[PDB]
Amino acid sequence: IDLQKTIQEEYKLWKQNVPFLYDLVITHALEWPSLTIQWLPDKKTIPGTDYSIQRLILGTHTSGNDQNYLQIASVQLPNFDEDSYTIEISQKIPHDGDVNRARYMPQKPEIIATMGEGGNAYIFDTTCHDALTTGEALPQAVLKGHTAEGFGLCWNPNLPGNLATGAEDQVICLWDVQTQSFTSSETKVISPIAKYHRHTDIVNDVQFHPQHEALLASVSDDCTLQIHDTRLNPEEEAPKVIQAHSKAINAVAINPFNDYLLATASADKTVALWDLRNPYQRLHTLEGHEDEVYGLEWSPHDEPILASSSTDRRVCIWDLEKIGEEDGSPELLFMHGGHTNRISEFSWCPNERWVVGSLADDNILQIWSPSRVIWGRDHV
């Protein structure tokens, strides 16, 4: 793939340092760039081997006219010891537009929701897509509600089948997806159970609280963070609207261990920290990215660890326990520099500690782990 001269220089410096800064790097080019990535929760152990098989959801983003696909990639991840590996596209499911975002249902991971063409969302049941299917691979459901494409998508981890989406139409849709009717022969057409008309610009991201069924956070180009209670009536305005940044907010992430800790990522190159009990008081600002921050995700294993990604091509990992303080930001624990274009999405591996899968706009998939020399510094 074409690299500009300076980019090519940087990438070769990065590769030279990889053995010192990383315990693992696996690189792969995909036939099409993917806008989205998420590790599936399952791990398949082959007894007697030094690896396990894990899986990732990927999408495509085609130049135009060429068919798009929702994809599942199977990855050989080595076991990490205590004193090349294969990546194949397992399933490929025809998808209508670009796959702007894709998320498996936590309670039923064979069910995958996507944000696709023109604002339609789609539901796929992977057990309806296999070598035995007789006709067209169809979505199991199309969710008709948005009037423009969107990138906000989140399943409710405490209410099976409950889905939230947000789009460039400024709207948040709530959906109730009942899956026990799904078939490979028909596409169910579903309308929303509620629509929120509370943002005044593109809704970039939505996230259900991991421990509270009714709490939905949303962020927008209107520079607000909003906390909605989906028990109350839909056109009643969100009981919490925060003027959180001076520029567009692209991502929101709720700590999966600290039920009050929320993070936002913004076009002001900043990540900010928020206490949900008193959400108008910003707790801290995290600086280090050189361009807009677009992606945000807490470690699934370590409460103080947060990752962010940016059009500056970096994934940054932040250690919140270093906030209390010899010239750079102490909470910036690690900066991944393996990508040569803007990062589209990344995802923490749920089955291995300190492993990230990341994608960039130039078709590269990287699976990497920073060295325990960096993250285990205060181990014994």
Author numbering: 20 to 102, 119 to 360, 368 to 422
Reported in the publication:
Centromeric chromatin in fission yeast is distinguished by the presence of nucleosomes containing the histone H3 variant Cnp1CENP-A. Cell cycle–specific deposition of Cnp1 requires the Mis16–Mis18–Mis19 complex, which is thought to direct recruitment of Scm3-chaperoned Cnp1/histone H4 dimers to DNA. Current structural and biochemical data suggest a model in which Mis18 provides the principal link to the centromere, whereas Mis16 is responsible for recruitment of the Scm3–Cnp1–H4 complex, which allows Cnp1–H4 dimers to be inserted into chromatin as a prelude to complete nucleosome assembly.
We first solved the crystal structure of S. pombe Mis16 both alone and with the N terminus (residues 14–44) of histone H4 bound at 1.9 and 1.8 Å resolution, respectively. Overall, the structure of S. pombe Mis16 and its interactions with histone H4 closely resemble those of the homologous Schizosaccharomyces japonicus Mis16 and the human RbAp46/48 proteins and exhibit a highly conserved interface, which has been extensively described by others. Residues 56–63 form a β-strand that continues β-propeller 7 of Mis16 and stabilises an extended loop from 107 to 116, which is disordered in the Mis16 structure alone.
